Design a protein around this ligand. Structure first.
Ligand SMILES: C=CC1=C(C)/C(=C/c2[nH]c(/C=C3N=C(/C=C4\NC(=O)C(C)=C4C=C)C(C)=C\3CCC(=O)O)c(CCC(=O)O)c2C)NC1=O
Ligand SMILES: *[C@@H]1O[C@H](CO)[C@@H](O[C@@H]2O[C@H](CO)[C@@H](O)[C@H](O)[C@H]2NC(C)=O)[C@H](O)[C@H]1NC(C)=O
Ligand SMILES: CC(=O)N[C@@H]1[C@@H](O)[C@H](O)[C@@H](CO)O[C@H]1O
Ligand SMILES: CC(=O)N[C@@H]1[C@@H](O)[C@H](O)[C@@H](CO)O[C@H]1O
Ligand SMILES: CC(=O)N[C@@H]1[C@@H](O)[C@H](O)[C@@H](CO)O[C@H]1O
Ligand SMILES: *[C@@H]1O[C@H](CO)[C@@H](O)[C@H](O)[C@H]1NC(C)=O
Ligand SMILES: *[C@@H]1O[C@H](CO)[C@@H](O)[C@H](O)[C@H]1NC(C)=O
Ligand SMILES: *[C@@H]1O[C@H](CO)[C@@H](O)[C@H](O)[C@H]1NC(C)=O
Lengths: 50, 286, 49
C-alpha cells in the first residue's frame, strides 16, 4: 500500500508510481534519506495477528 | 530506435473559430421531437480553437498540449496522416500513459508506463518499383513496463497512399476522463473543404468507456511521415509530410439546449450563457 | 406493448418522454423496438339522483 502521496486520488484513479516522496523542503534526487521516504510500504500479515 | 526531427520551419500558432462544434450525445437514452436541456462538458459555440497544419509545400506540428478538462479534437484528412494520441502527465516512464495508435493493421489502445521519445512518429515509405505504399517506421516509445490495460481491434488495412487535391474526411473526437473512465465520442463525415473547419452541425456519438484510472493533464498527437527517394538525407531529414490538418479545442462545463428530431438525431443546439440571446432561448426552451 | 418505428442506435436500450417515463424498449431477445403505452385512459363521470 501507498503511505505518502502529494495529494489525494480521484475516484477509481490508479497510481502505481514508485518515485521517492519528498516530505521535506529539499529535493531528494530519487534517493532514500531523511525526509525522503519511499512511498510504498507493505503489510506484515501473520496468522497470530489481531 | 527513435530519432529527432531537425528540418522544421517554425511559425506562430494558427487559430480558427469553432462554428457550432463539440456536441455529443450526453447519454444513451433515445429521445425524439424534443428540446432537452443538459449540463455537461461541451465545446463552447463559436469558440477559438488552435489549428495545426501538417504540410510540406516543411511545416508540421505535433507539440505536447494541455488536456484541460477534456479535449475536442478534429482533423481534416486525405491520406490518413493523423493516426493516434498520447495522453498522460510526464510521458517519461515515471507514470502510466495512455497510447491510442492506428498503425494501418490494428487499432491498439494501451495504458502502460511508456518511455516516450522526444518526438513520437510513424513512417511510410515510397516504393518506386511498384505503386504501393507500406508502413515501416514505428517510433512512439522506446520501452514499456508495468503495462496495465491493453486492447487490440480486429486486423484490417486501409489506404495510406498519398492523395492530392482537396481533403475528403473530417474526423471529430471528444476525449474526457471522468472518474477513471476515458470516454471517447466521435463522428466521421465526408467533406469537400480545403482550409478551415466546415461550418455546420453534426452530433458526436459515443464510441469508449475505457477504465484506465489515469491522471491525465497533457496529450500529444501522432503524425505519420512520407519517406521517399525524393527526400534525401538520413532518418532525421530524409522525409516529407503529407498535407492534412487538425484542430484542438477545450471543453468547459456548460448547459446546452439540444434538439432531437423525429428520428432521434440531434440537429441543433444552443450554448446557454453564450450571450443574452442564448440565455433567452434557454429560458423559453425554443 | 406495441410495435414501433423508433430507430434506436446500437447503444440505446430505452426511450423516454420529457417527463422521463419509459416510452419504448429494445426487446433483449429479438432486436425489435416496442412502445409502452399505459393501459388506463379516459374519464368516468357518475350521474345520480
Ligand atoms: C486512432 C484510433 C481509432 C479510432 C478511435 C477509430 C474508430 C473507428 N474508425 C472507424 C472507420 C474508419 N477509421 C479509419 C481511419 C481513421 N479514422 C480516425 O479517426 C483516425 C485517426 C484514423 C487513422 C488515420 C478508416 C480509413 C475507416 C474506414 C473508412 C471507410 O469506410 O473507408 C470505425 C468503424 C469500424 C467499422 O466499420 O465497424 C471506428 C469504430 N479508428 C481508429 O483508428
Ligand atoms: C495529476 O498530475 C498533475 C501534474 O503532475 C498534478 O498536479 C501537480 O501537483 C504537484 C504537487 O506538488 C504540483 O507541484 C504541480 O505544479 C502540479 N501540476 C499541475 C499541472 O497541476 C496533480 O496533482 C495530479 N493529480 C493527482 C490526483 O495526483
Ligand atoms: C530537442 C530534442 O529532441 N532533444 C532530444 C533529447 O532530449 C534526447 O535525450 C535525445 C535522445 O535521442 O534526442 C534529442
Ligand atoms: C518487386 C517490388 O519492389 N515489390 C515491392 C515489395 O518489395 C514491397 O515490400 C511492397 C510494399 O508495398 O511493394 C512491392
Ligand atoms: C506494479 C509493478 O509492476 N511494479 C514493478 C516493480 O515491482 C518492479 O520492481 C519494477 C521494475 O521491474 O517494475 C514495476
Ligand atoms: C481567441 O479567439 C479570438 C477570436 O475572437 C482571437 O482574437 C484570439 O486571438 C484567440 N486567442 C489567442 C490567444 O490568439
Ligand atoms: C427519418 O428516417 C426516415 C427513414 O425512414 C427518413 O425518410 C426521414 O427523412 C428521416 N428524417 C430526417 C429528419 O432525416
Ligand atoms: C436467443 O438468443 C438469440 C440471439 O443470439 C436470439 O436470436 C433468439 O431469439 C433468442 N431466443 C428467443 C427465444 O428469443
Amino acid at each position: 500500500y501507498r503511505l505518502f502521496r502529494k495529494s489525494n486520488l480521484k475516484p477509481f484513479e490508479r497510481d502505481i508510481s514508485t518515485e521517492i516522496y519528498q516530505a521535506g523542503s529539499t529535493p531528494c534526487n530519487g534517493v532514500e534519506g531523511f525526509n525522503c521516504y519511499f512511498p510504498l510500504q507493505s503489510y506484515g500479515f501473520q496468522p497470530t495477528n489481531g | 530506435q527513435c530519432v529527432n526531427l531537425t528540418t522544421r520551419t517554425q511559425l506562430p500558432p494558427a487559430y480558427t473559430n469553432s462554428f457550432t462544434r463539440g456536441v455529443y450525445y450526453p447519454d444513451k437514452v433515445f429521445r425524439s421531437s424534443v428540446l432537452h436541456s443538459t449540463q455537461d462538458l461541451f465545446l463552447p459555440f463559436f469558440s477559438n480553437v488552435t489549428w495545426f497544419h501538417a504540410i510540406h509545400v516543411k511545416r508540421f506540428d505535433n507539440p505536447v498540449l494541455p488536456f484541460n478538462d477534456g479535449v475536442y479534437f478534429a482533423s481534416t484528412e486525405k491520406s490518413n496522416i493523423i493516426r493516434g494520441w498520447i495522453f498522460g502527465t510526464t510521458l517519461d516512464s515515471k507514470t502510466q500513459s495512455l497510447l491510442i495508435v492506428n498503425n494501418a493493421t490494428n487499432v491498439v489502445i494501451k495504458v502502460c508506463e511508456f518511455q516516450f521519445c522526444n518526438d513520437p512518429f510513424l513512417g511510410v515509405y515510397y516504393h518506386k518499383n511498384n505503386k504501393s505504399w507500406m508502413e515501416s517506421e514505428f517510433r512512439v516509445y522506446s520501452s514499456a513496463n508495468n503495462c496495465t490495460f491493453e486492447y487490440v481491434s480486429q486486423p484490417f488495412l486501409m489506404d495510406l497512399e498519398g492523395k492530392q487535391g482537396n481533403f475528403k474526411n473530417l474526423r471529430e473526437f471528444v476525449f474526457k476522463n471522468i472518474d477513471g473512465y476515458f470516454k471517447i465520442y466521435s463522428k466521421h463525415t465526408p467533406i469537400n473543404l480545403v482550409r478551415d473547419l466546415p461550418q455546420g452541425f453534426s452530433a458526436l456519438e459515443p464510441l469508449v468507456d475505457l477504465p484506465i484510472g489515469i491522471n491525465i493533464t497533457r496529450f500529444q498527437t501522432l503524425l505519420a511521415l512520407h519517406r521517399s527517394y525524393l527526400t534525401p538525407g538520413d532518418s532525421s531529414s530524409g522525409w516529407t509530410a503529407g498535407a492534412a490538418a487538425y484542430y484542438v479545442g477545450y471543453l468547459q462545463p456548460r448547459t446546452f439546449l439540444l434538439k432531437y428530431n423525429e428520428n432521434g438525431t440531434i440537429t441543433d443546439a444552443v450554448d446557454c450563457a453564450l450571450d443574452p440571446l442564448s440565455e433567452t432561448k434557454c429560458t423559453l426552451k425554443s | 406493448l406495441t410495435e414501433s418505428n423508433k430507430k434506436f442506435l446500437p447503444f440505446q436500450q430505452f426511450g423516454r418522454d420529457i417527463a422521463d417515463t419509459t416510452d419504448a424498449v429494445r426487446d433483449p431477445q429479438t432486436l425489435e423496438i416496442l412502445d409502452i403505452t399505459p393501459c388506463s385512459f379516459g374519464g368516468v363521470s357518475v350521474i345520480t339522483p
